[PDB]
Design a binder for this molecule. Structure first.
Ligand SMILES: [Ca+2]
Length: 110
């Protein structure tokens, strides 16, 4: 979620900006496309196929611009952490309950 991608501290966001900056150092429009993704794969020792690059970008490209921006990159990291929340009960459940009472206070005070 874009809302939960804004529920990350500025220390955490800066650690995701410093990784994304290495991807878009060669980019023109400041967004990760198959050109930057491919050059990064080879730097990591991988040999990706054209299709492999096209599928990885389209999976995390939400706006359909053909590129992955910083807001879209943060959502990928949010999803990586959120999907790894099962099969667990206490930590996920406490986050959802705590968010529920937080929403109830915001409707009253807002
Ligand atoms: Ca995009």
């Amino acid at each position: 979620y874009k809302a939960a991608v804004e529920q990350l501290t500025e220390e955490q966001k800066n650690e995701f900006k410093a990784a994304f900056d290495i991807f878009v150092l060669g980019a023109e429009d400041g967004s990760i496309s198959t050109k930057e993704l491919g050059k990064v794969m080879r730097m990591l020792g991988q040999n990706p196929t054209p299709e492999e690059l096209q599928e990885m970008i389209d999976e995390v490209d939400e706006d359909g611009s053909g590129t992955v921006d910083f807001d879209e990159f943060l959502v990928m990291m949010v999803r990586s952490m959120k999907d790894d929340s099962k099969g667990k009960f206490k930590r996920p459940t406490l986050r959802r309950v705590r968010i529920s009472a937080d929403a109830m206070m915001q409707a009253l005070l807002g």
